[PDB]
């Protein structure tokens, strides 16, 4: 009879409880305090204009129906009590295919405080959309967003909030960086009110500022292009009495420039505008072609 008192507390807690009704349905506004702990900022896919993130997503609110009084001041309950009470229906406005992990059990956390305050934490991997403008590729800086809010609960029913100071709410771990190509500079939270065909909803926005690293594209494309341009300019020091020599020079440097341009344009998505690697490759191709036409003229 050591766990019978807690069983009685939990049974009395859910006796007369409707998990279809938010706390204060026609009396008050539900105040949800949100928190995000990023455990790893996943890889940013450039061809889908998306990114992946893995977060501990914490939400706190106050339900006056879940007041208890017992030998403990906080009940750290399972992840199956959360499905028997009202929890907010938070979704990610720009999510593509997110997963809420349930290995080995549903990675959810429920803590009820004796005055009725609940802390509800989830572990989930979000794959969100990051619309990018690739004018300055590969020397571009982005602000990948992560917008969430409540599905079906408007501003007069459920409002969101950060639980700590907004500059200290979205917290990224130190070892949590799965970025190969980018660099996470900082975070940036925001709050607003969007309006859709069902009403006005509160939306909590987070921006992660990424700055692409050029050290790969340099060695991949920029150094072969400059080497090819210099090797094309080598031909200007040869004697004109060797016509096949300079001919094979010109045609093979144009051939390597074509292969490099094709091999370089597969990196980024199938965008319809010109980037800065495309401008660099175009100017380098112009220089090579100028060398060949100069050879043709001489």
């Amino acid at each position: 009879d050591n766990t019978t008192v807690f069983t009685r507390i939990l049974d009395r807690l859910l006796d007369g409880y409707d998990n279809r009704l938010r706390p204060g349905l026609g009396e008050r506004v539900t105040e949800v305090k949100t928190d995000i702990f990023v455990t790893s900022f996943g890889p940013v896919s450039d061809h889908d204009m998306e990114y992946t993130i893995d977060v501990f997503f914490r939400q706190s609110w106050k339900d006056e129906r879940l007041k208890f009084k017992g030998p403990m001041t906080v009940l750290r309950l399972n992840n199956l009590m959360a499905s028997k009470i009202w929890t907010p229906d938070t979704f990610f406005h720009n999510g593509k295919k997110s997963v809420a992990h349930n290995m080995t059990m549903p990675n959810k956390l429920l803590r009820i405080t004796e005055d009725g305050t609940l802390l509800y934490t989830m572990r989930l991997t979000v794959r969100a959309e990051c619309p990018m403008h690739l004018e300055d590729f590969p020397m571009d800086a982005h602000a990948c967003p992560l917008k969430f809010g409540s599905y079906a609960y408007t501003r007069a029913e459920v409002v969101y909030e950060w639980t700590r100071e907004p500059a200290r709410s979205v917290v990224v771990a130190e070892d949590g960086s799965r970025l190969n190509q980018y660099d996470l500079l900082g975070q940036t939270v925001d709050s607003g009110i969007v309006q859709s065909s069902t009403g006005e909803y509160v939306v909590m926005t987070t921006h992660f500022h990424l700055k692409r690293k050029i050290g790969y594209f340099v060695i991949q494309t920029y150094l072969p292009c400059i080497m090819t341009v210099i090797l094309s300019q080598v031909s200007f020091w040869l004697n004109r009495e060797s016509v096949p020599a300079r001919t094979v020079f010109g045609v093979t440097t144009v051939l390597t420039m074509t292969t490099l341009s094709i091999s370089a344009r597969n990196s980024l998505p199938k965008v319809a505008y010109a980037t800065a690697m495309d401008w660099f490759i175009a100017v380098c191709y112009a220089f090579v072609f100028s060398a060949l036409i100069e050879f043709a003229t001489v």
């Epitope: 907004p166 500059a167 200290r168 709050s191 607003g192």
Partner: antibody, heavy 116, light 105 residues
Framework: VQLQQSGAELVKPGASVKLSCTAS????????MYWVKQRPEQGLEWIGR????????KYDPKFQGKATITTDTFSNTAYLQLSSLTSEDTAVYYC???????????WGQGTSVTVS | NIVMTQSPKSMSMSVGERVTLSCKAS??????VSWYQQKPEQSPKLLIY???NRYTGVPDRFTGSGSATDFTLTIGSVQAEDLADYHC????????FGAGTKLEL
């Protein structure tokens, strides 16, 4: 809905003071409590921050080590303790309540602390 | 420490016209800037929260306009009781206020 602070008083240079702020109309375990200091005909200055539910506090770097904020949930009060006073501490101290998108919507009546 | 620069320090104007106050931040404060009104020998009262969100109990003549760095408060058709000090304060980080703005007739 209402925040009631203590009364104005004088204090000798070098002593310690304990200002109080009694909340009525809500539970302090729900929101944060801010302490703000205002000089005569100057701008407001933020002293510190307390989270009454957990108990952890933050302070302005200028006021770090000078002020100590504590709470008492039984009497529904919040306290601000000032130590090692100087002559530039003659001000009006306000007790504010966080709410509605981090705005400090509800303020106290303000206590006048004078250093003679 | 995010600093808020308010402008102007003082402004004298009559009753009925439109007036505008500006506030600028050093760092980023994304629509977390509140505007308070403090009358002489009184406590500050919240006028605008968020960046553009009228507090429940304020007239419609106050309007806020927000950004990431530049914020403004516009009062159209002022009255004789809208004279007070006005402070802008950010809340994106630990709160810091502006210098203030006196309003005289």
């Amino acid at each position: 809905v209402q925040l009631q602070q203590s009364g104005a008083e004088l204090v000798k240079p070098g002593a310690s003071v304990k200002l109080s702020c009694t909340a009525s109309g809500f539970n302090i375990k729900d929101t944060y409590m801010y302490w703000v200091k205002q000089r005569p005909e100057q701008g407001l200055e933020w002293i510190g921050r307390i989270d009454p539910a957990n108990g952890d506090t933050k302070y302005d770097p200028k006021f770090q080590g000078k002020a100590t904020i504590t709470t008492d949930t039984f009497s529904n009060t919040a306290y601000l303790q000032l130590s090692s006073l100087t002559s530039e501490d003659t001000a009006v101290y306000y007790c504010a309540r966080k709410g509605l998108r981090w705005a400090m919507d509800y303020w106290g009546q303000g206590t006048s602390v004078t250093v003679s | 420490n995010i600093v808020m620069t308010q402008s102007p320090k003082s402004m004298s104007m009559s009753v009925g016209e439109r007036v505008t106050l500006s506030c600028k931040a050093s760092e980023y404060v994304g629509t977390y800037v509140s505007w308070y009104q403090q009358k002489p020998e009184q406590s500050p009262k919240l006028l605008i929260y968020g960046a553009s969100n009228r507090y429940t109990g304020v007239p419609d003549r106050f309007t806020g306009s927000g950004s990431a760095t530049d914020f403004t408060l516009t009062i159209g058709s002022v009255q004789a009781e809208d004279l007070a000090d006005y402070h802008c304060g950010q809340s994106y980080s630990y709160p810091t206020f502006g210098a203030g703005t006196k309003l005289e007739l």
